[PDB]
Design an enzyme around this catalytic site. Structure first.
Site, short mmCIF file in Angstrom:
data_model
loop_
_atom_site.label_atom_id
_atom_site.label_comp_id
_atom_site.label_asym_id
_atom_site.label_seq_id
_atom_site.Cartn_x
_atom_site.Cartn_y
_atom_site.Cartn_z
N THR A 159 -1.68 1.92 4.05
CA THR A 159 -1.11 0.62 4.40
C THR A 159 -0.54 -0.18 3.21
O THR A 159 0.65 -0.52 3.20
CB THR A 159 -2.04 -0.14 5.38
OG1 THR A 159 -1.86 0.42 6.72
CG2 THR A 159 -1.66 -1.62 5.46
N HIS A 265 -7.16 4.00 14.77
CA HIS A 265 -8.32 4.48 14.00
C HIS A 265 -9.49 4.78 14.92
O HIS A 265 -10.22 5.76 14.70
CB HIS A 265 -8.79 3.48 12.93
CG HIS A 265 -7.97 3.50 11.69
ND1 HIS A 265 -7.96 4.56 10.82
CD2 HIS A 265 -7.11 2.58 11.19
CE1 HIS A 265 -7.12 4.30 9.83
NE2 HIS A 265 -6.59 3.11 10.03
N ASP A 691 13.46 14.32 -19.82
CA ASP A 691 12.93 14.15 -21.18
C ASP A 691 14.05 14.21 -22.21
O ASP A 691 15.04 14.98 -22.06
CB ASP A 691 11.92 15.24 -21.55
CG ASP A 691 10.65 15.19 -20.73
OD1 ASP A 691 10.43 14.22 -19.95
OD2 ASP A 691 9.87 16.16 -20.80
C1 LIG Z 1 8.77 -4.45 6.22
O1 LIG Z 1 7.97 -5.56 5.81
C2 LIG Z 1 8.44 -6.28 4.73
C3 LIG Z 1 9.66 -6.02 4.01
C4 LIG Z 1 10.05 -6.84 2.92
C5 LIG Z 1 9.23 -7.93 2.54
C6 LIG Z 1 8.02 -8.16 3.27
C7 LIG Z 1 7.60 -7.35 4.38
C8 LIG Z 1 6.32 -7.61 5.18
C9 LIG Z 1 5.17 -6.71 4.74
C10 LIG Z 1 3.96 -6.94 5.65
N1 LIG Z 1 3.59 -8.37 5.73
C11 LIG Z 1 2.29 -8.87 5.69
O2 LIG Z 1 1.99 -9.93 6.20
C12 LIG Z 1 1.28 -8.07 5.19
C13 LIG Z 1 0.11 -7.83 5.84
N2 LIG Z 1 -0.65 -6.99 5.08
C14 LIG Z 1 -1.96 -6.47 5.52
C15 LIG Z 1 -3.16 -7.24 4.98
O3 LIG Z 1 -2.96 -8.21 4.26
N3 LIG Z 1 -4.48 -6.77 5.30
C16 LIG Z 1 -5.68 -7.45 4.80
C17 LIG Z 1 -4.75 -5.61 6.17
C18 LIG Z 1 0.07 -6.71 3.88
C19 LIG Z 1 -0.26 -5.89 2.80
C20 LIG Z 1 0.66 -5.84 1.79
CL1 LIG Z 1 0.20 -4.78 0.47
C21 LIG Z 1 1.92 -6.50 1.78
C22 LIG Z 1 2.79 -6.33 0.58
C23 LIG Z 1 2.27 -7.32 2.89
C24 LIG Z 1 1.33 -7.41 3.93
C25 LIG Z 1 4.68 -9.34 5.98
C26 LIG Z 1 5.88 -9.07 5.07
CA LIG Z 2 10.32 12.58 -18.37
ZN LIG Z 3 -4.92 2.32 9.11
#
Ligand SMILES: COc1ccccc1C1CCN(C(=O)c2cn(CC(=O)N(C)C)c3cc(Cl)c(C)cc23)CC1
Ligand SMILES: [Ca+2]
Ligand SMILES: [Zn+2]
Ligand SMILES: *[C@@H]1O[C@H](CO)[C@@H](O[C@@H]2O[C@H](CO)[C@@H](O[C@@H]3O[C@H](CO[C@H]4O[C@H](CO)[C@@H](O)[C@H](O[C@H]5O[C@H](CO)[C@@H](O)[C@H](O)[C@@H]5O[C@H]5O[C@H](CO)[C@@H](O)[C@H](O)[C@@H]5O)[C@@H]4O)[C@@H](O)[C@H](O[C@H]4O[C@H](CO)[C@@H](O)[C@H](O)[C@@H]4O[C@H]4O[C@H](CO)[C@@H](O)[C@H](O)[C@@H]4O)[C@@H]3O)[C@H](O)[C@H]2NC(C)=O)[C@H](O)[C@H]1NC(C)=O
Ligand SMILES: [Cl-]
Ligand code: NA
Ligand code: NA
Length: 805
Positions: A159, A265, A691
Site C-alpha cells: 500500500t 484481506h 556506470d
Molecule cells: C492516486 O492517488 C494519488 C495521486 C497523486 C497524489 C495523491 C494521491 C492519493 C494517495 C492516497 N491518498 C490518501 O489519503 C492516502 C491514504 N493512505 C493510507 C493510510 O494513510 N493508512 C493509514 C492506511 C495513504 C498512504 C500514503 Cl503512503 C499516501 C502517500 C497517501 C495515502 C489520497 C491522495
Molecule cells: Ca550504475
Molecule cells: Zn492490504
C-alpha cells in the site's frame, strides 16, 4: 502539546493547517489527536443520514443535519448528493446517456477543469469485469471515458510504496518508502504502518503532486482524511470546497477508500463477502457524480479512478518457515509476509554471514515457495535495490504464499484469506485505471501501463511542470484529448568514427589464432560494400542508437550485423542484426571453434586480447552477433572478430548460447523475422544507471577488459506479423531482457538439466522495458522510424510479462 480549548466554528475542514499548540479543524486533526474540543459536534454532523427523502424537501434549514434538502442548500453548497433527484425531478448521473465531453463545460470563474483523484486500496484489475453488475457508476466512468484493462503497480505491491509512487512518479528505491515497514540504519529508526514514526518528513523523498501543485501556484487544499471520518462526509466536504470562491478554491482533490482491501484481506479477492464492499464503493462514486451534476461540474471535472495494487488468495497454512532452513534463525531479523527482507539481528555480530544464509536458502526443498537474492541480483525491472532501507538479502515469494521466521510468529501474531506485495508482474496484483472528463478521450481503451507514468499526466492535467521522476513524459499522451506534452528526442552527445582498414595483421599481439588462411574479383567488391555498410538498412532498421554521454566509439559494418564499438570499454555498446523467418541456423565448424580474429579497422591498443581470457581461470568469452546465424560460411569469419567478443562466465555461456542458437530462430519463426540489438550493461552500484569507467569493480584478469554485470537484448518486429520484420509499414512489437551476468546458475534450481528446461524461464523472469535498457546504457533507440515519437515512447515503456490473460 495542543491547547485544544479553541473552537471550530466557521472553520470546519479549513484548508491551511494551524500550528501548535492552537487546535486544528482540518481533515487530519484526529490522526494527530489535535482537533478542537467541538470538532465532532460542529464538523462531523450525522443527524438524518446522507440522503434526502420526499418529506425533507423544502424543509426549514436545520443546521444539525449531516446534509440539507432545504431550498437554500444549492447556494450554501451543502445539499445531500441526491437532493436534486429526490426533490427536483432530476435523474442520477449513472442513468444519463453518456455524451462526449469535447470541451470543458465549467461555470464562470473556473480557470481550468478541476482534477478529482478517487483512489481505492486493493482494487484488483479483474474486478472491473467480474464485479461489473454491481458497479454501475464505475462501469459508466470506465466505458465512457478512457480506461486500461489494468495498470501495473510497483514492487513491492504494498500500500504505502504504491500510493507514494502514484503521488511522485518515482520508484520506491528513489522515493524512500520501500515497504510498509522499514529500518533506516543512518537514522537508526524504524518506520511502521501502526504508529507515529511514519509521520516524520525525513522518510519521504521526491516531490509528491500536492507539493508540486503548491509550489507552482495551483491550490491543492488537503488530500488526506483521518480514518474514522466516513466516506459520505469526505464526499460532502469535497463538494463544499468546490463551492468556495475562485481565489480560495483548490484545483485538485483526492478521495481515498480503504476498501476493497480491508475485506479482501479477510475474505480473499473473490470471497462472497466481497460483493458488498464493491457495491459500497460504487455508491460513493455515484454520490460524487450526482454531487458534481448538482454543481454543474460533471462535464467540467477530470476524474481519475485508480487503485494501488490487487489481492491474491493467501492463507496461514501456505507459509514457509526460515527455521526449517537455517540453524542460526535467532541471529536474523526478518521483514516477513509476501516478500522477505533479512538483516542481522545485532550489528556487533561478526559471526553473521550473508553468503551462508543465501546458500542455506537456495533450492533446499523441491517445491520451495520463495527464492533468495542479493538485492543487486533481483530482476532489473523491479528497480528494487538502490536504497539503504532495502536489506541486502531479499526473498521473492511465490504468489499465494507467505514467508515467516518461525511458526510462533504466525500464531503469537487462520485469520486472513487475502494478501498482496508479490512481484508486480503477477496478474492478481494488477490494479485499475480509469480517466473521465474533458481532457481524457471519449470511449477509449488504452494498453496497460505502469503507475510510475501517472504523476506526469496529473501534472499535465493541472498545467504543472513535473519534478524529475521515473515516468517517460509523453508515453501516455494517447490517454488525452489535449494538454498533451510534446517531447523531443534527446540530442546525441558523441558522434561515432567510421574507421576503414588501418592496421596490418602482424601489428596485433593478442594471443589469438584462427584457422582462416584460405583465398575472386566479383566477391571482392562484395566484401568491400559489406564493410562500407551496404546491407546496413537490413540490419539496422530503426537507425543507429544515439549515445547520450561523452565517449569514443566506432561504427563497424558487416554483412550480417552492425555494431557501435566502444574504444573505452573495448567491446560493443550495441550490436544490431536482423534474422528473417526464412534464415537458417548453422553450427560452428570444428576448425573455427577457438577462432578469434584481429579487426584491422581497430588498433591493437583498443582491442581485447585472447591471452587475458586464457590467464583468467573464471572468465571465458562470447560473441554479441552469434556465429550460428551467419548468412554464409564466408560471412561467418566476421562473427569471430575480436570486436564482436565480450567476457562471459562459463555458467552464463550456457544461457547465452541457448538464446542465440535456439531462441532467436524460434522468435524469428513466430514473429515473422526479428531485429535484434544486444550488448553489455555495467551497473556495479545497482542504481539502474550506466556506470562510468571508474565505477567498474571487475576486469578480466590482468587487463582493462571490464566485466559486464548484465547482457541485454531488444527484439523488435512488426505488430502486424503478416509483414516481415524488415518490411514493416506500421506499429512495432518489442520484447527485451536484461540477463544477469552471473558466475553460477544458482538462481535456476533446474540448471543441471538441459537448457530447454530452464533457460527460457530465467529469461522471462528478467524481461525488461527498452527504457530500462536506455537508463542502463546511456543509449537512445528507435531514432529513425516512421512512427510518431509519443507512440515510440509508449513502445519503450512496454514490458512483455509472460502471464496469461
Ligand atoms: C492516486 O492517488 C494519488 C495521486 C497523486 C497524489 C495523491 C494521491 C492519493 C494517495 C492516497 N491518498 C490518501 O489519503 C492516502 C491514504 N493512505 C493510507 C493510510 O494513510 N493508512 C493509514 C492506511 C495513504 C498512504 C500514503 Cl503512503 C499516501 C502517500 C497517501 C495515502 C489520497 C491522495
Ligand atoms: Ca550504475
Ligand atoms: Zn492490504
Ligand atoms: C528515477 O528518477 C529519479 C529522480 O530523477 C532519479 O534519481 C535522481 O538521480 C540523480 C542521479 O543519481 C540524483 O542526482 C544527484 O543529486 C545529489 C543531491 O541529492 C539531493 O537533492 C535532491 C533534489 O532535491 C533530492 O531529491 C535527493 O534526495 C535523495 O536523498 C534523500 C535522503 O538523503 C531521500 O529522502 C530521497 O528519497 C532521495 O534518495 C534517493 O536518491 C539518493 C541519491 O541522491 C540515493 O542515495 C537514495 O538511496 C535514494 O535512492 C537529495 O537530497 C547530488 O549531490 C549529486 O551530485 C553528485 O554527482 C555529480 C555529477 O553530476 C557531481 O557534480 C558531484 O561530484 C556529486 O558527487 C558528490 O557526492 C557523492 C555522494 O556522497 C560523493 O561520493 C562524491 O565524492 C561527491 O562529493 C547528483 O546530482 C538525484 O538525487 C536523484 N533523485 C531522487 C529523487 O532520487 C533516478 O535516477 C531514476 N531512476 C532510474 C532507474 O532511472
Ligand atoms: Cl513491507
Ligand atoms: Na578463461
Ligand atoms: Na542451479
Amino acid at each position: 502539546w495542543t491547547a485544544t480549548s479553541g473552537s471550530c466554528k466557521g472553520r470546519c475542514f479549513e484548508l491551511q493547517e494551524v500550528g501548535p499548540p492552537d487546535c486544528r479543524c482540518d481533515n487530519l486533526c484526529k490522526s494527530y489527536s489535535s482537533c478542537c474540543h467541538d470538532f465532532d459536534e460542529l464538523c462531523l454532523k450525522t443527524a438524518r443520514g446522507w440522503e434526502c427523502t420526499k418529506d425533507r424537501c423544502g424543509e426549514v434549514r436545520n443546521e444539525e443535519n449531516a446534509c440539507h434538502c432545504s431550498e437554500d442548500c444549492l447556494s450554501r453548497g451543502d445539499c445531500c448528493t441526491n437532493y436534486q433527484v429526490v426533490c427536483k425531478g432530476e435523474s442520477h448521473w449513472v442513468d444519463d446517456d453518456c455524451e462526449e465531453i469535447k470541451v470543458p463545460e465549467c461555470p464562470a470563474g473556473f480557470v481550468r477543469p478541476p482534477l478529482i483523484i478517487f483512489s481505492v486500496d486493493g482494487f484488483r484489475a479483474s474486478y472491473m469485469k467480474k464485479g461489473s453488475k454491481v458497479m454501475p457508476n464505475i462501469e459508466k466512468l470506465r466505458s465512457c471515458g478512457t480506461h486500461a484493462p489494468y495498470m501495473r503497480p510497483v514492487y513491492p505491491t504494498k500500500t504505502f510504496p504504491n500510493l507514494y509512487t502514484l503521488a511522485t512518479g518515482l520508484y520506491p528505491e528513489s522515493h524512500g518508502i520501500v515497504g510498509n515497514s522499514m529500518y533506516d540504519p543512518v537514522f537508526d529508526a524504524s518506520f511502521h504502518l501502526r504508529g507515529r514514526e511514519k509521520f516524520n518528513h525525513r522518510w519521504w523523498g521526491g516531490q509528491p503532486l500536492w507539493i508540486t501543485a503548491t509550489k507552482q501556484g495551483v491550490r491543492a487544499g488537503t488530500f488526506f482524511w483521518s480514518v474514522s471520518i466516513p466516506h459520505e462526509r469526505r464526499i460532502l466536504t469535497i463538494l463544499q470546497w468546490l463551492s468556495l470562491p475562485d481565489n480560495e478554491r483548490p484545483s485538485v482533490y483526492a478521495f481515498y477508500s480503504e476498501q476493497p482491501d480491508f475485506s479482501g484481506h479477510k475474505y480473499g479477492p473473490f470471497g462472497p463477502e466481497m460483493t458488498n464492499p464493491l457495491r459500497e464503493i460504487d455508491k460513493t462514486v455515484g454520490q460524487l457524480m450526482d454531487g458534481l451534476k448538482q454543481l454543474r461540474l460533471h462535464r467540467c471535472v477530470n476524474v481519475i479512478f485508480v487503485g494501488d495494487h490487487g489481492m491474491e488468495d493467501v492463507t496461514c497454512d501456505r507459509t514457509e518457515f526460515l527455521s526449517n532452513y537455517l540453524t542460526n534463525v535467532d541471529d536474523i531479523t526478518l521483514v516477513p509476509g509476501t516478500l522477505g527482507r533479512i538483516r542481522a539481528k545485532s550489528i556487533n555480530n561478526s559471526k553473521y554471514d550473508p553468503k551462508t544464509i543465501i546458500a542455506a536458502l537456495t533450492c533446499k526443498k523441491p517445491d520451495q515457495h520463495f527464492k533468495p537474492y542479493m538485492k543487486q541480483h533481483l530482476p532489473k525491472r523491479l528497480h528494487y535495490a538502490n536504497n539503504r532501507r532495502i536489506e541486502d538479502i531479499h526473498l521473492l515469494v511465490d504468489r499465494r504464499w507467505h514467508v515467516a521466521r518461525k511458526p510462533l510468529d504466525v500464531y503469537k501474531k487462520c485469520f486472513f484469506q487475502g494478501d498482496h506485495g508479490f512481484d508486480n508482474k503477477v496478474n492478481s496484483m494488477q490494479t485499475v485505471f480509469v480517466g473521465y472528463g474533458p481532457t481524457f478521450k471519449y470511449r477509449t481503451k488504452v494498453p496497460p501501463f505502469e503507475n510510475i507514468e501517472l504523476y506526469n499526466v496529473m501534472c499535465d492535467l493541472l498545467g504543472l511542470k513535473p519534478a524529475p521522476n521515473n515516468g517517460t513524459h509523453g508515453s501516455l499522451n494517447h490517454l488525452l484529448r489535449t494538454n498533451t506534452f510534446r517531447p523531443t528526442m534527446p540530442d546525441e552527445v558523441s558522434r561515432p568514427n567510421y574507421p576503414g582498414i588501418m592496421y596490418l595483421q602482424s601489428e596485433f599481439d593478442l594471443g589469438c589464432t584462427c584457422d582462416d588462411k584460405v583465398e575472386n574479383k566479383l566477391e571482392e567488391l562484395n566484401k568491400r560494400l559489406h564493410t562500407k555498410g551496404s546491407t546496413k538498412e537490413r540490419h539496422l532498421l530503426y537507425g543507429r542508437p544515439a549515445v547520450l554521454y561523452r565517449t569514443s566509439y566506432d561504427i563497424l559494418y558487416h554483412t550480417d550485423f552492425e555494431s557501435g564499438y566502444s574504444e573505452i570499454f573495448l567491446m560493443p555498446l550495441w550490436t544490431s542484426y536482423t534474422i528473417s523467418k526464412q534464415a537458417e541456423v548453422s553450427s560452428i565448424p570444428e576448425h573455427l571453434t577457438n577462432c578469434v580474429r584481429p579487426d584491422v579497422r581497430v588498433s591493437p591498443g583498443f582491442s581485447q586480447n585472447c591471452l587475458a581470457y586464457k590467464n583468467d581461470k573464471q572468465m571465458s568469452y562470447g560473441f554479441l552477433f552469434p556465429p550460428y546465424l551467419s548468412s554464409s560460411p564466408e560471412a561467418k569469419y566476421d562473427a569471430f572478430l575480436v570486436t564482436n567478443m565480450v567476457p562471459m562466465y562459463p555458467a552464463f555461456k550456457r544461457v547465452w548460447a541457448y538464446f542465440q542458437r535456439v531462441l532467436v530462430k524460434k522468435y524469428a519463426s513466430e514473429r515473422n523475422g526479428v531485429n535484434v540489438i544486444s550488448g553489455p550493461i555495467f551497473d556495479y552500484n545497482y542504481d539502474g544507471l550506466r556506470d562510468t569507467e571508474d565505477e567498474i569493480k571487475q576486469y578480466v584478469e590482468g587487463s582493462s577488459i571490464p566485466v559486464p554485470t548484465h547482457y541485454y537484448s531488444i527484439i523488435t518486429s512488426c505488430l502486424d506479423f503478416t509483414q516481415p520484420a524488415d518490411k514493416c509499414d506500421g506499429p512495432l512489437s518489442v520484447s527485451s531482457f536484461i540477463l544477469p551476468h552471473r558466475p553460477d546458475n544458482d538462481e535456476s534450481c533446474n540448471s543441471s538439466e538441459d537448457e530447454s528446461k530452464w533457460v527460457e524461464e530465467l529469461m522471462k523472469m528478467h524481461t525488461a522495458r527498452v527504457r530500462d535498457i536506455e537508463h542502463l546504457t546511456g543509449l537512445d533507440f528507435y531514432r529513425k522510424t516512421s512512427r510518431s515519437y509519443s507512440e515510440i515512447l509508449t513502445l519503450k515503456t512496454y514490458l512483455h510479462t509472460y502471464e496469461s490473460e
